[PDB]
Amino acid sequence: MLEQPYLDLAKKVLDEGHFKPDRTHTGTYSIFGHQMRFDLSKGFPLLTTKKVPFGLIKSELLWFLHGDTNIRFLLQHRNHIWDEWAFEKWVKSDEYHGPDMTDFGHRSQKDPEFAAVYHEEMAKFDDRVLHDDAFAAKYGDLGLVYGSQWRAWHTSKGDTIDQLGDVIEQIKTHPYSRRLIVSAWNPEDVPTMALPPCHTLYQFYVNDGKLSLQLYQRSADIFLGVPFNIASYALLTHLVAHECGLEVGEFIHTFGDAHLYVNHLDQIKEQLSRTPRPAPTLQLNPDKHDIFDFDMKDIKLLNYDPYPAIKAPVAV
């Protein structure tokens, strides 16, 4: 059924992945090299075997599409996928006051009592970013995320290349190039990088009315990472295709290091004893059009009938 590529991967890892020590200690079973496909005219790859939140991944996506770096947008649409970072930018400066922030989430899922001091420290700052403007302006900014990457690349003669923008106009302009590419890997930077872009590069291809997209992703967490990345890039594609007036073909995903966390071997097994239910569908607001002004109500998802959800340890 559409999402079966992930199960064939989830299996295949558990099954022939090597034990690698990751950037922490956490065991990972790994595959290097895999490509996987989904025919978006037949449906949406939200996994129906583990409920995934659409509201969460759409808000983040649009905030990417808005060239926005500031962690505030998200806070307005109670999304918290990017906070932990701004906190290190915050706890590290000369203004941080009070406590032992000195690790916060790395001793949350097991700790101390951290969740009353890390999460109160955290809510106080998340609450601050949402109201104090000079504050927002200060720590909530994050810098180089995919929004700045995609919509305003930094150039060698001080400007800003809206790489994406230009690639959607390149589609209208002529269907055919092997050059409809939006990179997010900037070699200059990855010295001073927080989280390097995982979903390192992509490419679009028009072909007789079906748009398609290929994503090269340096690494995958096949439990928490991959369910949300397969969807983000499918919403982008439905959104990029409706802007330059096309219809939608497939989505193709290519990973460098797909790996599943040694913490998560139990929990995948749990999904693998499930048996898929049909794919959800997606209404794309048909009067609205310059996709950078898609507002959240313009992407209403229909028919999402998921299984219950599984409990992960944090990917450290």
Place this chain on the structure above:
Amino acid sequence: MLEQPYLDLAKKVLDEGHFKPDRTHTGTYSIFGHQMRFDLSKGFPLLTTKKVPFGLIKSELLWFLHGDTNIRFLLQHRNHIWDEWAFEKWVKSDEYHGPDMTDFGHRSQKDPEFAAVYHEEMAKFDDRVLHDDAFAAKYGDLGLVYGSQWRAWHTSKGDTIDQLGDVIEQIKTHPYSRRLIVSAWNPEDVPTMALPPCHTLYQFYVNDGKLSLQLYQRSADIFLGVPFNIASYALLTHLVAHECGLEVGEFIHTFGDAHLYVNHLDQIKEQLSRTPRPAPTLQLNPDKHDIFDFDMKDIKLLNYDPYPAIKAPVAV
């Protein structure tokens, strides 16, 4: 037998490729998305069904590995894979004298009589680049090729990032990152680009002594392009692996637009009536070591037993 991935692709295109007009008019049958693998401990992917020249692709590779852009190196090791470009840089300036260069190779494979005026114009300049220094210095330079891309990325505060260099030291330093990446797509540039890097990105992965490499290539010519690209990236890998003291696992190739030229449908068929002979082998000079000073005699290839070769029209 090792090279069978290409035949399964060559077939598969002829067989389910769409007719696309390319950047010229030339018909192409296309596949978008494919990944293909070769276990370099079992041999070398020089096609034994169409003789491919190793001498040619090694010289070019080392000149890449030397951060060299100047078309001269090549001329010394009678390689001509990059001349046509320097000629447009040459014919376009205020110094070009004499003739109708006004298209040269685009009316060579069918023309005029071009091959006496284009090829004499061309040999006169190829001969000039090899001796006139201020000349070499002038038109033979080419600029942004993979050598400048890989060994000296241009930075926003006027310097030079030896991206590759740093990635081979990252291997010695620690086997494991999902961050052993050398991009060659610089969004700033591809306005003013001659030929954008086709083999857009790659990534290495150590895993218990086998190094491996994954190449994302925006487009492929599955007749002339692909035979030489599968090898270039396998020599790099044998060369990158012997430098940071590893052994060699697989090579994985991922293409955006693989396509085979409509001119070449006859000629692939010809290869497909052949039946492979075992894979060649490769001696990597075992006293020599900082791979940027690999000289050509240090990569002696052993056992190359090819079929005869097929005749292509130029990929325009």
